[PDB]
């Protein structure tokens, strides 16, 4: 009846919420990974620039 339908409405809500949280965490992780890669690239570039200036 109503209780049985609600027992599965909760399941459907959880199913949607899992996907929503997965998407949100994926966006956050993409931002974090992009930031980390950019920081590594920037540090490498700064080191290369310092070495290039000294060699110049």
């Amino acid at each position: 009846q109503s209780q049985g339908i609600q027992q599965l409405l909760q399941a459907e809500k959880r199913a949607a919420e899992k996907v929503a949280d997965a998407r949100k965490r994926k966006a956050r992780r993409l931002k974090q990974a992009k930031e980390e890669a950019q920081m590594e690239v920037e540090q490498y570039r700064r080191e290369r620039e310092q070495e290039f200036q000294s060699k110049q």
Binding site: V19, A22, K26, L30
Partner: protein, 55 residues
Amino acid sequence: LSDADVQKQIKHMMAFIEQEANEKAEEIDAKAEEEFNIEKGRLVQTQRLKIMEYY
């Protein structure tokens, strides 16, 4: 008929729904691996190309 036996079909349908959700989650993880690596590599290639051209 009885609630227990009908619970069998109910649980089968619930398992179908949960398997669809697990497939969606696996798709999300596959995105976060493959597409995330692709995006990070594209950003790295662009940044490195610009920086090395400037160098």
